Structure 1
Amino acid sequence: ITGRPEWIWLALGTALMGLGTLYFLVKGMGVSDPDAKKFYAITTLVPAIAFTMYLSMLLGYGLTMVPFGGEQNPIYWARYADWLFTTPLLLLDLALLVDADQGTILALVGADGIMIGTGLVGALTKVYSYRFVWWAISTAAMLYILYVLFFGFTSKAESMRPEVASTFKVLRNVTVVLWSAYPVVWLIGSEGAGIVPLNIETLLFMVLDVSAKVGFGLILLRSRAIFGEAE
């Protein structure tokens, strides 16, 4: 395990996701409100899935070698397995907060699936120049998602409770900033142009992942917006 310099960040990531999972699990024990239960379920599952995939990367299972540029390049494929399930759960948290219509939710989840799926294909593609074609398609799917979060959701939040409108606005802003960093790190890291070494890349993704999951969850689950308006 320690044979890879990036192991320290995989281990820290595993620990922080594990701790985040346990914290949300305990916190949600005292919850009976049916609406709050939905948000706790979604939000606890996110770091639990990430915990398993960080562990698989730490132990070496979630790593494969991909030939491109005349080299055997270490590619952590387990990231995409994580993201396939956790990024639509994160979007679902946002969509339920603002009572999004079903068509909009399906558009978001579908675009998200395309985003992660094409990122996976790009990560595993052996023809170097083609990796960036997949990156571009994935990034276009991301831009669609960000567009919807701003010009379909923000003006939906404003007709809702003030506490859900303010909580949505904060989580929207956190999401757009954090999620936009992922394609940049991929592009300059070992999957793309290879300018930033894998150990630093792994650190960067770990900070983004913990912030986008445990950070996000801490903000959401401390808000009164997750509860039905009750006396």
Structure 2
Amino acid sequence: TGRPEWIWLALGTALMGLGTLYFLVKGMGVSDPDAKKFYAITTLVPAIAFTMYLSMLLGYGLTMVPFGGEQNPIYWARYADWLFTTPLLLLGLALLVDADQGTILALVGADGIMIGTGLVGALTKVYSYRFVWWAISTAAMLYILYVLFFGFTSKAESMRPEVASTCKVLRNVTVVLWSAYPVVWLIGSEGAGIVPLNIETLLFMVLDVSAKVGLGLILLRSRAI
């Protein structure tokens, strides 16, 4: 394909594909009912990401949205990805910090709102409004990141100073990470146009592989803890 971004989408499809295969094989020999849940989650995330990245690469997950006086290329497929993978990623984190059912419901609902309002902002035909939908979506994220920071910090403490002060390098990687997405959307082609589309695609691809594959490894791992 010609579109400059094909390479980052092709690289994302390759990587997510490799990660889901690695997690499918790693998940063989697991019979513990809770190692099974964590493996179900950790494997499904990159599997969904793989399909959505391929849809963007093959051109299906792409659409044109008029605003600011132009026909802007908007990859709606990402939101379909994030719509299922983010709930699943918080699910893993919540099972981790042995959070209660009500908390899982708040995080997930707030996460649906966050992705749902991002897609509306991503598809709004009136320029200025996109940013209103960007703020509401980021407000829903501060909420999420809030509940998480005190989900990890509340658990980080109940463990030794070598393992307590560690479930901290998970809480921490997970929050800086997520915070990248709003800034990538805002300076990107959906948000402002400060950064070109092929760089924005690169930024999101480096972020997506980090949070689904990279972190998944880190997450799965540090069980004992």
Q: Same fold (TM over 0.5)?
A: yes
What does the per-residue CA deviation read over 1:14-72, in whole Å, with 9 as the maximum and x for residues that have no partner?
00000000001100101111111110000000000000000000000000000001100
Question: In structure 2, how many angstroms separate the alpha carbons of the residues matched to 1:5 and 1:25?
Answer: 32
RMSD over equivalenced CA pairs, Å: 1.7
Distance (Å, rounded) in 2 between the aligned partners of 1:24 and 1:167: 24
Identify the range of structure 1 (123-132 vs 143-152) with the bigger mean alpha-carbon deviation.
143-152
Any conservation in 2 of the 1:18–1:48 contact (CA below 8 Å)?
A: yes
- CA distance in 1 between partners of 2:33 and 2:48 (Å): 23
Q: Could you tell me how far 1:163 is from its partner in structure 2?
A: 9.0
CA contact (8 A) 1:167 1:223 kept: no
Distance 2:82 2:15 in 1: 17
> Percent of aligned pairs with the same residue?
99
Aligned ranges 1:89-100 → 2 under 5 Å: 89-100=88-99
* Residue in 1 that maps onto 2:45: 46
Secondary structure at 2:164's aligned position in 1? helix
Counterpart mapping for 1:15-164 below 5 A: 15-159=14-158
Stretch of structure 1 that moved more, 27-36 or 61-70: 27-36
Aligned residue-pair number:
225
Which stretch of the first structure deviates more once superposed, 8-17 or 24-33? 24-33
5+ long unaligned stretches in structure 2: none
Cα distance change on mapping 1:44 and 1:164 into 2, 3 Å: farther
Task: Name which of structure 1's ranges 51-60 and 144-153 shifts more when overlaid on structure 2.
Answer: 144-153
Structure 1: give runs of 5+ residues left out of the alignment. Answer: 227-231
Q: What is the SS of the residue equivalent to 1:126?
A: coil
**Which protein, 1 or 2, shows the higher relative CO under an 8 Å CA cutoff with sep ≥ 6?**
1
> 1:189/1:150 Cα in 2 relative to 1: closer, same or farther (>3 Å)?
same
CA contact (8 A) 2:16 2:209 kept: yes
The normalised TM-score by structure 1 is: 0.93
